[PDB]
Design a protein around this ligand. Structure first.
Ligand SMILES: NS(=O)(=O)c1ccc(OCCCN2CCC([C@](O)(c3ccccn3)C3CCCC3)CC2)cc1
Length: 468
């Protein structure tokens, strides 16, 4: 409306006043996404974008929030005539959804840095005419709810956003851009992407949000960064509390990455009486396994990063091998580059630095060292096997000589007597089966006393010939 009952909690004078607002909206049949996004972008603006004047918490007076709310709703209602788009079943049509998308798109500034911080909210849309990629999709959803279109919902994969709608919520529509350069399928289904088994569309195991999960998304979208070096403590705490509130209400059940975000926040600043980060990261993984057929990559990476920051080398390598075990059943397609970059950085920067440190600490007399544990070697091998398998049948290559260099260095960190304890068995403590043809052909090289660097390179990149 706003409705009288949504107004009684104003002004919001503190973090807990914001949380109380979220609680009361989440009590409702339909939490108000426009109200809540405006409030978050407001508080984010005055705690991270401009802190001038801040003495505690930027007071969100009803007069300010209501006028922002009225601007959004007038802008949408004025520009979308619902009577031109008749609704059977209480469900929306593709043309209606496209028009709402076009409205949001056309309101945006022509040129701006599309990956700035703080352009995710309806606050940024209204005050700055700017939105990031997935912010456009959220905004389309908000606009749809404000028009009474309750079939329209946010869909998310690990790197993109679109909408679902229509009979049984079975239709999909592209409403925003993806990445740098991707030309458009705006208005189309995602079924081509699903059918080609790219990571971008998660072989169809992407998130189909209900309203509560859309609130969870805007809370994950809170960006506490003030600059490269500094975070807003007030926004970190707000985000954390909001996530716990969503957790207790059961609204993070089908949101794996939200559980990873919470775990990260708990590591930074733990809440007395709550599960530890590890429990959290494992619920994020169990959520992916239960609702998304274990087809998601980030739950394992979040866990891996935690183990990496704490120097549990063994556990970090296990998590990354689990990561690769997911990716192996995808095809590497155009538009999957963000997950290529994540794997590239693991293999070729993070793991080599972890293992270099472990080599020094071994020289310094460390026991139980990753580099003396054959299970750690097996995890490293499983990691690469999954990447190799991922590459098979993909329309674009993954591996090249730049990866081979780090592979050779990483294998060399483990002595022969440690590498030879891994048992590699065929289809048809440490025991390991390779699914990839590259790693199967490599198996003897990997356990040789002397690592044959040139042969490993040839096997990893399938380079036919050596120097004339
Ligand atoms: N090197 S590592 O330790 O293995 C590691 C690497 C990446 C990691 O990434 C964790 C961050 C994952 N991130 C969260 C924001 C998320 C997203 O950027 C986002 C943005 C806004 C709100 C919710 N999610 C997406 C969701 C789909 C569309 C945008 C994309 C995935 C963690 C660890």
């Amino acid at each position: 409306g706003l409705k009288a009952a949504q107004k009684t909690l104003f002004p919001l004078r503190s973090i807990d006043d914001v949380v109380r607002l979220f609680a009361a909206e989440l009590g409702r049949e339909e939490p108000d996404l426009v109200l809540l996004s405006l409030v978050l972008g407001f508080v984010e603006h005055f705690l991270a974008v401009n802190r001038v004047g801040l003495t505690y918490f930027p007071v969100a007076d009803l007069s300010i929030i209501a006028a922002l709310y009225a601007r959004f709703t007038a802008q949408i209602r004025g520009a979308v005539d619902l009577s031109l788009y008749p609704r059977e079943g209480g469900v929306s049509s593709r043309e209606l959804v496209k028009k709402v998308s076009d409205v949001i798109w056309n309101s945006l500034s022509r040129s701006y840095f599309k990956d700035r911080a703080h352009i995710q909210s309806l606050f940024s849309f209204i005050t700055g005419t700017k939105l990031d990629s997935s912010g456009v999709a959220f905004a389309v959803v908000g606009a749809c709810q404000a028009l009474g279109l309750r079939d329209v919902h946010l869909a998310l994969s690990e790197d993109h956003a679109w909408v679902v709608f229509g009979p049984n919520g079975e239709q999909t529509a592209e409403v925003t851009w993806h990445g740098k350069g991707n030309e458009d399928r705006r208005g189309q289904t995602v079924n081509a992407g699903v059918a080609e088994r790219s990571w971008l569309y998660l072989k169809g195991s992407y998130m189909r949000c209900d309203r509560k999960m859309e609130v969870a998304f805007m809370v994950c979208a809170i960006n506490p960064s003030i600059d490269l070096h500094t975070d807003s403590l007030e926004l970190l705490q707000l985000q954390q509390k909001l996530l716990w509130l969503l957790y207790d209400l059961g609204h993070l059940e089908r949101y794996p990455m939200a559980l990873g975000n919470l775990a990260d926040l708990e590591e930074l600043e733990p809440t007395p009486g709550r599960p530890d980060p590890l429990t959290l990261y494992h619920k994020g993984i169990a959520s992916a396994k239960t609702y998304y057929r274990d087809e998601h990559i980030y739950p394992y990476m979040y866990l891996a990063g935690y183990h990496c920051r704490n120097r549990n080398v063994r556990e970090a390598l296990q998590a990354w091998a689990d990561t690769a075990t997911v990716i192996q059943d995808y095809n590497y397609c155009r538009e999957d580059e963000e997950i290529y970059k994540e794997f590239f950085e693991v293999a070729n920067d993070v793991i080599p630095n972890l293992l270099k440190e472990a080599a020094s600490l071994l020289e310094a007399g460390s026991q139980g060292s990753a580099l003396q544990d054959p299970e750690c070697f097996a995890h490293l091998l499983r990691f690469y096997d999954g990447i190799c398998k991922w590459e098979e049948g993909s329309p674009t290559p993954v591996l090249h000589v730049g990866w081979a260099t780090f592979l050779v260095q990483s294998l060399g960190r483990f002595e022969g007597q440690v590498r030879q304890k891994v048992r590699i068995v065929s289809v048809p403590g440490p025991v390991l089966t390779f699914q990839s043809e590259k790693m199967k052909g490599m198996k003897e090289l990997l356990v040789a006393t002397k690592i044959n660097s040139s042969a490993i390179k040839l096997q990893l990149t399938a380079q036919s010939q050596v120097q004339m």
